[PDB]
Amino acid sequence: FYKREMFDPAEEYKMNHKRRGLALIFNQKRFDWKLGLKTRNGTDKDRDNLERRFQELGFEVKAYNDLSAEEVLEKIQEASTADHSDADCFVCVFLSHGEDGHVYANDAKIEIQELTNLFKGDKCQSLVGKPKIFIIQACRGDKLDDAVTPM
Amino acid sequence: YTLPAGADFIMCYSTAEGYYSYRETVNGSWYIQDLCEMLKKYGSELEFTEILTLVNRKVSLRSVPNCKDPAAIGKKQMPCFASMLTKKLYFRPK
């Protein structure tokens, strides 16, 4: 047969590097008076839970509690410019309030594209073609979803 | 062989855009609770987006039982993942 399928539906990311990779967790519990945000009690249970499952899967987990926005970008840039050559991939988790397209650090808004841009191929080359996983536990607005029933 | 700079991201959101997310003060948020429960059961066995679809199903069946303000009682939460992935992702043990 002259036409080989070049996009096999079974194709998988190669997950056979030396390390699994970094998982960062940004746990935001308390906020500046200037932000006017209520304290997210229960989030440490979320953090401890994520750190456990991510360790079970092989990641190196770095959990930060209540960092400022500048410090979040500092730890993001630190991950962005690291050597991911023998990592399978990269995870980044954010536990905060948010809205629009931004989450809150301890003191200030952070657009989610600020979290993601430093890992785009043109900036973090050692991750090109590797999965980059971002998890946002945050409000994205203030609508409520109603309950409906199949008929 | 070139890729987009935007390739192979997956954005996993606890709720749909514009909408609230819900959190238990003892057990943590609905989404992370269910994500970790699915990861515990199938992290090393299933494709990551099938897990997220399971998480989607689990959070979808919950209902706000009681709320510091009662206008969210009986309300729902639908999570949503945005995939820019190009292959199947597994965390099979290594």
């Binding site: 209520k38 | 997310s21 819900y22 238990e24 948020s29």
Partner: peptide, 4 residues
């Protein structure tokens, strides 16, 4: 349950 809380809102966040």
């Amino acid at each position: 349950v809380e809102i966040d």
